[PDB]
Ligand binder design. Structure first.
Ligand SMILES: NS(=O)(=O)N[C@@H](Cc1ccccc1)C(=O)O
Ligand SMILES: [Zn+2]
Ligand SMILES: [Zn+2]
Length: 304
């Protein structure tokens, strides 16, 4: 049984992607953009009312297997889209004028493993040459200063960069989709936890994007909007100096493809529960995060 206020296993999220699409055919379609290491379908939802030459926003969740609140958020976003369409003026305008590509779980194999064997697993579940250690960090596997600072060359490490950029089937699938839809995708949003941040480029080096002032102002305003609901305090800024330097991240890669609005969200909390955020916080976390996502979306729409 699926619930938006609980953490759902992969079988349940998979079934949900089919059911939410069949229940909302005028607003949602579903495709698979590839398969994981273990052969699971990587589902992607296109959320929006059909129309001509619509720009798009791309949002993924579940890069990191243990960050269960991320997976919950992508589901919550779709929940909001279908529930409030027609009733809330902004969400309705967004869905009428833009498409949201929502990838509810990227690292499906890792997610399954957090349910079955090890709640604190992070990486994919692929093999590595010359060792029995498993997995690559998907957020060190993109072609963005690949395998330099904040990424490990050791396959037994939690930030292992992989054998090559896009070595993982999952990251290759996501990068292929973005490259194939680059002319329409205007913003890239990638949802993680924890530590309460809105990050933008760059993480792979201490450098700033050409539109730094714009991104800084946008992130600042999104954080302020998020705080209006429950007073939850987020920090923001370029990744390298706001959290830590880390190469091979998808947000930086997406930005370097020309997607000018590229953000990594780190959701609740600040470490009390960390990755094992209780189910009792799903609602509040998702609702406040919606305000930041809607703020960013509204900005993108008005600055086409
Ligand atoms: N969610 S997290 O704890 O893993 N934090 C992220 C931070 C991060 C964000 C953007 C680019 C590189 C790194 C990570 O991939 O390390
Ligand atoms: Zn993460
Ligand atoms: Zn709501």
């Amino acid at each position: 049984g699926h619930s938006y206020e609980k953490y759902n296993n992969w079988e349940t999220i998979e079934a949900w992607t089919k059911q939410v699409t069949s229940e909302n055919p005028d607003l949602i379609s579903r495709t698979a953009i590839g398969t994981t290491f273990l052969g699971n379908n990587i589902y992607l939802l296109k959320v929006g009312k059909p129309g001509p030459n619509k720009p798009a926003i791309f949002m993924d969740c579940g890069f990191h297997a243990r960050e269960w609140i991320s997976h919950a958020f992508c589901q919550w976003f779709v929940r909001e889209a279908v529930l409030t369409y027609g009733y809330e003026s902004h969400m309705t305008e967004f869905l009428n004028k833009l498409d949201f590509y929502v990838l509810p779980v990227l690292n499906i194999d890792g997610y399954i493993y957090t349910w079955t064997k090890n709640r604190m697993w992070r990486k994919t579940r692929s093999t590595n040459a010359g060792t029995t250690c498993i997995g690559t960090d998907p957020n060190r596997n993109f072609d963005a200063g690949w395998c330099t600072t904040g990424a490990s060359t050791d396959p037994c490490d939690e930030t292992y960069c992989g054998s090559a950029a896009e070595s993982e089937k999952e990251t290759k699938a996501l990068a292929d989709f973005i490259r194939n839809n680059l002319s329409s995708i205007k913003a890239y949003l990638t949802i993680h936890s924890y530590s309460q941040m809105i990050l933008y480029p760059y993480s792979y080096d201490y450098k700033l994007p050409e539109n730094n002032a714009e991104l800084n102002n946008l992130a600042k305003a999104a954080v302020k909007e998020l705080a209006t609901l429950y007073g939850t305090k987020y920090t923001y800024g370029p990744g390298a100096t706001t959290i830590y330097p880390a190469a091979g991240g998808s947000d930086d890669w997406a930005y370097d493809q020309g997607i000018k609005y590229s953000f990594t969200f780190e959701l609740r909390d600040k470490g009390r529960y960390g990755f094992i955020l209780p189910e009792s916080q799903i609602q509040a976390t998702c609702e406040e995060t919606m305000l930041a996502i809607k703020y960013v979306t509204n900005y993108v729409l008005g600055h086409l």
